[PDB]
Point group: D2
Chain length 114, copies 4
């Protein structure tokens, strides 16, 4: 139900071995860890959660872009990229969070399908 | 060797049934038709060409964004989106041209892999 | 030294009346309020801070995109757009944080200059 | 009535000295030269045309991104960034065409205002 895909706008490639952390907003407004992993050779991260676990709520996907750029020897602007959204059962069942990274910029979209 | 993928930033969905035309630049600097198709339910267009046909050269991928927006009842800015690039045998063998569409904006990247 | 500019990719316009909150990470690792404001008719937000006050640190610029889209009667995907960066770590710089908004997407870039 | 602004997503800066060519589609469907120029130190290009000359039509703004990246010693993917649009079809408007460049990617948006 929740996939992440990360691309590199400098190399023209998937962004490989990027750390990704997902958090769920708790009742006291703190961010509780929920799932995490590293993107694969295709820039994708699957298997974060399951339909049972992924209930409605506010989630934050933190992509560790700074470490990615540093591993390539490139000087970056951002500490990380953030994607904060509400999971909604009224819409389609599968969320893909896609991000496109540059040293001083990032873009993100949601692809929400059944 | 050449895939196109198109996403919709308004609906948060693949951009389905978008017409895509690929042209190759000819010796007299005109654009000759090369391949075309329409994106699938996943927003993807496969099977445009083959490794034998897809020789080095300058190619233009024209995505008919205006008709896409009009079919959804949305008033667009651009006539089409353009992606013009040189195919290079020194780099990886597979090109994916990805585009993310909004009514007054578009973004595109290349994902070039082996 | 810290300005924000926000554009609307649906309308082809500045994104007017967008709330922006800036935080700075404190020594205890919490996010301290730093400055806030709203974009103008030009999509710009000036006057958040001063060179004196804008010291080195890790800053988070939170752009309230959901509130923007909801005020236009649209149900968007994201809660906000966040831009988190270390500022002034090799002396003072001037930063422009630009964002381009759509209901299910946003993009951001920084323009950093040395006065 | 027609301005261009170009930013560099690698440097976090304006994209300076970027060549821009504007064409207009003619009655025979060819692309006629219309105006050209280069971005300044601020990444901006003003003075391309005049309200008199900028009549209704289909315009193509070609941003010479490959030449930019090559001048910086970088081998980029795209030949150029193209922005093709119908202008002034419900009377005069003022257009800003903005682009954000990376070696394998670009994004563009339009800001359209009614004077
Ligand atoms: O499989 C996919 C999926 Br799903 C999504 C994208 C979109 C990447 C993108 C972003 Cl994230 C922001 C601006 C422009 C772009 Cl082209 C690409 C591929 Br290939
Ligand atoms: O005055 C400005 C400033 Br300063 C910045 C931009 C960049 C807008 C943008 C973003 Cl933020 C992300 C992807 C693509 C784009 Cl064209 C435009 C203008 Br006009």
């Amino acid at each position: 139900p929740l996939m992440v895909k990360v691309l590199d706008a400098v190399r023209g490639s998937p962004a490989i071995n990027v750390a990704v952390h997902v958090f769920r907003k708790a009742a006291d407004d703190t961010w509780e860890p929920f799932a995490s992993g590293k993107t694969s050779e295709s820039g994708e991260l699957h298997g974060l959660t399951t339909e049972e676990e992924f209930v409605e709520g506010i989630y934050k996907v933190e992509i560790d872009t700074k470490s990615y750029w540093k591993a390539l020897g490139i000087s970056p602007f951002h500490e990380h990229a953030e994607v904060v959204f509400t999971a909604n059962d009224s819409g389609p069942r599968r969320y893909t969070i896609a991000a496109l990274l540059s040293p001083y910029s990032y873009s993100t979209t949601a692809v929400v399908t059944n």
